[PDB]
Amino acid sequence: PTPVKPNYALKFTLAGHTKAVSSVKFSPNGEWLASSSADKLIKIWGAYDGKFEKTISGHKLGISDVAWSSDSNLLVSASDDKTLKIWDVSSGKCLKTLKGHSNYVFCCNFNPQSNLIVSGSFDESVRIWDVKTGKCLKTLPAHSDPVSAVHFNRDGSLIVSSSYDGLCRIWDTASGQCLKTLIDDDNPPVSFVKFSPNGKYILAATLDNTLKLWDYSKGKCLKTYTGHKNEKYCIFANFSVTGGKWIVSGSEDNLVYIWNLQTKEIVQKLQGHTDVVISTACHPTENIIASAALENDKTIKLWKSDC
Numbered sequence: 009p010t011p012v013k014p015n016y017a018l019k020f021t022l023a024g025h026t027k028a029v030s031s032v033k034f035s036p037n038g039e040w041l042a043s044s045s046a047d048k049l050i051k052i053w054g055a056y057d058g059k060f061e062k063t064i065s066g067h068k069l070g071i072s073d074v075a076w077s078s079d080s081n082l083l084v085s086a087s088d089d090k091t092l093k094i095w096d097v098s099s100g101k102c103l104k105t106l107k108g109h110s111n112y113v114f115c116c117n118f119n120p121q122s123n124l125i126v127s128g129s130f131d132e133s134v135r136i137w138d139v140k141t142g143k144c145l146k147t148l149p150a151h152s153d154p155v156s157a158v159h160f161n162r163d164g165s166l167i168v169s170s171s172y173d174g175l176c177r178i179w180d181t182a183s184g185q186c187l188k189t190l191i192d193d194d195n196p197p198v199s200f201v202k203f204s205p206n207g208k209y210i211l212a213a214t215l216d217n218t219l220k221l222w223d224y225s226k227g228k229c230l231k232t233y234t235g236h237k238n239e240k241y242c243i244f245a246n247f248s249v250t251g252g253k254w255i256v257s258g259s260e261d262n263l264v265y266i267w268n269l270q271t272k273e274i275v276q277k278l279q280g281h282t283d284v285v286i287s288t289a290c291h292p293t294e295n296i297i298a299s300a301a302l303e304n305d306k307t308i309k310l311w312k313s314d315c
């Protein structure tokens with residue numbers, strides 16, 4: 009059962025990026041953390057001991073997001089250079105450069121099969137790409153302002169997208185056509201979305217200090233999580249599932265917030281960063297959180313809980 013609270017404590021601080029960190033993600037096999045930054049670099053770190061492993065270079069401008077393939081062997085990154093790059097993590101080599109967006113690429117993810125990448129851009133489109141060939145399969149005219157997040161569900165058949173236009177939409181992967189507009193407001197911006205692990209729910213952030221858990225099928229809000237600060241940045245949120253069932257997010261008051269998913273109560277706030285916590289990630293098997301901060305800080309912190 010979910011305990012009353014976790015007890016995340018700081019274990020490591022990872023320095024090396026020279027501008028704001030933009031995203032952190034654990035590999036599915038649990039071995040690694042990948043980070044991206046405005047400094048144009050991807051860094052790989054040991055997930056359990058924080059040990060710096062390597063830098064992956066090649067983008068010409070800053071990177072906003074990085075994501076792992078299901079087998080932990082590839083990464084995709086989204087850059088202000090208007091491209092995505094697919095990387096072989098072991099060799100550090102760029103396998104493909106995905107060209108087609110006409111402005112910054114902000115968000116990216118692989119499908120579970122890891123044969124497709126989805127991307128979202130400041131150009132207001134969502135693109136779907138073939139991993140093996142690097143070909144753009146589809147361009148969806150998804151939004152009327154920059155796309156803040158894109159994510160596939162557990163069987164790969166759906167993509168959820170969000171935007172500063174205020175919308176959250178769900179797309180059929182195979183045809184590219186819209187299944188549903190889940191959130192149909194013109195304000196506030198929807199700054200982050202993702203499916204829950206079982207695919208039944210969508211976690212959505214809006215730039216009014218609010219996270220919400222939605223039932224995809226019914227199109228209804230089930231839970232709202234508040235108390236943090238989020239009016240400007242596209243801050244990631246996570247489902248923590250290895251121990252207690254939490255929602256995790258960074259915040260513009262430099263804290264990591266952790267809520268009980270069911271009761272909506274704040275159960276812990278992690279203090280230590282000295283700038284906005286833009287990204288958090290939850291380890292796939294251990295009760296470990298990674299957090300990363302903007303340019304007054306530029307570090308990643310690894311935190312561990314007993315539950």
Ligand SMILES: O=C(O)c1ccc(Cn2ccnc2)o1
Pocket residue numbers: 029030031072073114115156157240241242243244286287
């Ligand atoms: O300007 C922002 O909002 C900003 C910079 C970096 C991030 C975090 N992020 C990246 C992709 N999805 C979320 O957000």
